[PDB]
Design a protein around this ligand. Sequence first.
Ligand SMILES: CC(C)[C@H](C(=O)O)[C@@H](O)C(=O)O
Ligand SMILES: CC(C)[C@H](C(=O)O)[C@@H](O)C(=O)O
Ligand SMILES: [Mg+2]
Ligand SMILES: [Mg+2]
Lengths: 364, 364
Amino acid sequence: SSYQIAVLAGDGIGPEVMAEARKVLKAVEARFGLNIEYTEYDVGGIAIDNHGCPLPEATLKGCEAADAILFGSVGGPKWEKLPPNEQPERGALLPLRGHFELFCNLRPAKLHDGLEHMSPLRSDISARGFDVLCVRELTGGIYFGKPKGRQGEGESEEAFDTMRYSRREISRIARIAFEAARGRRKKVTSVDKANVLACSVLWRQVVEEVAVDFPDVELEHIYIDNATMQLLRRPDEFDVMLCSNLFGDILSDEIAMLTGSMGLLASASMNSTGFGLFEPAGGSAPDIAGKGIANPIAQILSAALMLRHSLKQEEAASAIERAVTKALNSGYLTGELLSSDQRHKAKTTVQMGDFIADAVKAGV
Amino acid sequence: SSYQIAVLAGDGIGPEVMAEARKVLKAVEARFGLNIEYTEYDVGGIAIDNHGCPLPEATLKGCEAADAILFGSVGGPKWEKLPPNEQPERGALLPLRGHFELFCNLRPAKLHDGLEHMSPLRSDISARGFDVLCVRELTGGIYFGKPKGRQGEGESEEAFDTMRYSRREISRIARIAFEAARGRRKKVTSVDKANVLACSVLWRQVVEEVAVDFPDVELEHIYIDNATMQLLRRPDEFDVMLCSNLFGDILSDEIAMLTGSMGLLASASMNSTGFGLFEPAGGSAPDIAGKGIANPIAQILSAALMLRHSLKQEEAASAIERAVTKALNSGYLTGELLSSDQRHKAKTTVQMGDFIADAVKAGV
Ligand SMILES: CC(C)[C@H](C(=O)O)[C@@H](O)C(=O)O
Ligand SMILES: CC(C)[C@H](C(=O)O)[C@@H](O)C(=O)O
Ligand SMILES: [Mg+2]
Ligand SMILES: [Mg+2]
């Protein structure tokens, strides 16, 4: 039967990189005999312009009818004057995560062979490589906890946010981390602030409870402040990093920047039934939008993660991943991945998409 | 009149680096005619061993009678089996900050001339230098907010922590940041998560209120996740970074590690009357304790900050800072500051203290 994908390209470079993801997907559909239908919906900035809000009713209903959401990027200068609490990025993402109970965020990041020099780390550290999967709990903690608000006036006006976690919420994300570790390098590093936070005392406790089901996986705990430091000295010693909502927000961006290659990084946000939202790690880069410069790899790898986790099409997901590897080691690189004495070897967004789609079609 | 200093050397390397701070201070007392008396008290690990708790009554009362606290480092392997919530570091520091209302934490970090190569940043980034002062609010936010605890049992057992800030608490730390910026490079960067947290919406609002008193200082706002990334790409563009409690905990460690030289970094925690606690940024390094290897610079610069901020002895504080600079550019370096082909040029803890004290005495 026909899978149904909701396509939410958003703002900035979203539509131009989404076009290349669709191109690649068409090559995969033909090679593997998949029947996939796509419907496009406004989200973010474009939705505010066209409908008055960043997540229109029609869009939300469209996602409810889909097997997965293939998401681009949202936001730009034009809407920053809106209060930070009505801007498009938060306005679209928090309710989507909340509505669909997308509790599990996966953010894989690795240094690719040959591109170590783009990392902002010292060259002897980046030479060692790294490959870290950040597992972030997405629907609990301080993002959605109540009470939240403010009271009082004048000097004594106060605001409050509540961080809350239940054993059940911790155990379900921890299990995901352990199962992932089992397929990787069998180490989970859980990140908390258990010397200060009641939530973190419970976090650490529950993670140790879950660990009894995985005697083959090594478990260590690290404080969030220390983790930001250790990622700079020994990123090669981490495998799976397991984080609460806010800690994962922070650490995943640190790790992404350590690659030096955010155009290569994708993200999956999923619920327990396998429905998810799949997006590039980076932003909407409105200043390069419309010029065919943007790197479509992150959006293409988003589609690969969607095939794998939501559609259960492992062979098709793998084929995309290998087509990307082929591009990277055949010199098909975009401008931001070249030292700028090389900048004239740069491929455009379309050339990248064509190459990758052709590779899939050729049986890579 | 006689100043009174409470000396809390703590664990690990604390006592051996504290001895060098006292040595330097004796040279300063003679050169500037200061009358300072010191009383030593147990804190941390040693206090648990000798008194059953990390912050004995006698120690707390001793700090109440002092003009300032000169603090070493607390913690070590021996006490980690204690729950993270009874260990010495949290057990000593949170109640001290709480009791004395030490709302303002200053954590200056800079790359020193000639030591850029110790930074874990790529050499073209570290070559540009940086000098960032982290101002962290220390007594509010999620560290001390109520309610805090847990309820329920089994799968539905839940924990909670509450982040709370008042206009008054935000305005007082913001003013400190702006006044510091005014003496530095006239830029404050305020760090928040205003797209998610009610506290951060209020934070950003109050900081903009305070800014009207400082039309000469540039103000920008950045999200905490983005800040962790931008520190890796352009640390030279930041001057004063203004942070809430938890965000400052995280960012200040990231910045410290970017120096590559944590043995050079000191911290001040102060209340509005000028009483403070002054400590090295790093930990107690129990594995090198007792060998005369530890770098005493951080502890010596702690004493300089104490002279400046608590005792109002600017000339004496400055003299120490220049004696440290003299050591660094006369090849007086400890082992961790040398590439290990150079490791035999290393000076010991005592040699460093002697050199620095002699320099102060010679009128540096
Ligand atoms: C836009 C914002 C609400 C979001 C988050 O904080 O989760 C973003 O920073 C992220 O990492 O996806
Ligand atoms: C020991 C711990 C409570 C403390 C904090 O979180 O403030 C420490 O990490 C720090 O940075 O001083
Ligand atoms: Mg983020
Ligand atoms: Mg800390």
